[PDB]
């Protein structure tokens, strides 16, 4: 497995294009009818930073949950004692740029549990192998992963 390079995105197209995670459909709000589409991930082998102390980072689409759970397994196999960590998931708060897939519960920003920045290139490769539709080595501090809509 070869790590992604810094600022590399796979596939090599923009996130919201047809061959990556596709079109932003619209923002999902807590009060809404579309909220019921989101399902909480309480996998004990995934660390959720829970920046807002709401548990909102756990709420994600079915495909997001499926690819995140596969990545949780490959992270533990890659580095025994280390877990997948989510820094940002579903965004109720406008903390991402306009038309972010975070607003749709279709995207996670991730690290390893030990916050070893040197692991993040390989983490991104693992995210691609776990079947995330778009993977972006966005900063030294995190990998951005998203999925297609249901």
């Amino acid at each position, epitope marked *: 497995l070869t790590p992604l390079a*810094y*600022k590399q995105f796979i596939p090599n197209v923009a996130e919201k294009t047809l061959g990556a995670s596709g079109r932003y459909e619209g923002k999902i709000s807590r009060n809404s009818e579309r909220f019921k589409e989101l399902t909480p991930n309480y996998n004990p082998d995934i660390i959720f*930073k829970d*920046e807002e102390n709401t548990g909102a980072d756990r709420l994600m689409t079915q495909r997001c949950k499926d690819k995140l759970n596969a990545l949780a397994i490959s992270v533990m196999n890659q580095w025994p004692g280390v877990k997948l960590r989510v*820094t940002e998931g579903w965004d109720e*708060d*406008g*903390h991402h*740029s306009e038309e972010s897939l975070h607003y749709e519960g279709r995207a996670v920003d991730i*690290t390893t549990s030990d*916050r070893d920045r040197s692991k993040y290139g390989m983490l991104a490769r693992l995210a691609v192998e776990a079947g995330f539709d778009w993977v972006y080595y*966005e*900063s*030294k*501090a*995190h990998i951005h992963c998203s999925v297609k809509a249901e």
Partner: antibody
Amino acid sequence: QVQLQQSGPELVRPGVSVKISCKGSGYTFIDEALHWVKQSHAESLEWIGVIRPYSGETNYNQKFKDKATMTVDISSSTAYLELARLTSEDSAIYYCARDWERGDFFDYWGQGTLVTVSS
Amino acid sequence: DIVMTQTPKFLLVSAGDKVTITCKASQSVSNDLTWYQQKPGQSPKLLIYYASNRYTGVPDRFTGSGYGTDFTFTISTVQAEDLAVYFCQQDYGSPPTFGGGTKVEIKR
């Protein structure tokens, strides 16, 4: 509401050290890196270093390696910057500033501590 | 260490007019370029990161562009309250380094 509260202004004699403080509230203090930034007339904004409370890791700008020491007290949510052997070139405003795990850039800043080095 | 050359050093502009600030890195810094606004007596305030991403609650009139060495910050339609020193900062290289700033002054 995230807040970084710095200690007051300091008058310090040349040759002497000073230790200035930065208390975080409104977030889990241990979870974010805390950076220190100098603002003088002579050199505008300069990054001094970072401490990662969660690991005790420190990274210093080589220009400050002999000057600065960063520590943290987790139980008081307070970061400290000690500046040793002061000269007039150390007179400046010192800021603490946090990142939020998106890179080494700073959403929340302390109000700044003015340090005047003088006899 | 990476050197950030910010131009111009100052600008006098009327409310409603455009401001264009340039930041040039001494080597490529990918998109790891942050813009801050420092109003007098205050700490710097984060406006733009990753060269073009507005921070939460930053108004639309502030944009940024660039990748590599050459970065542009724009205020589309400057407001009276936008008087400040603006700074760019790179964090591709360690240590992070800042530009010298651009003072924006209002003509009325």
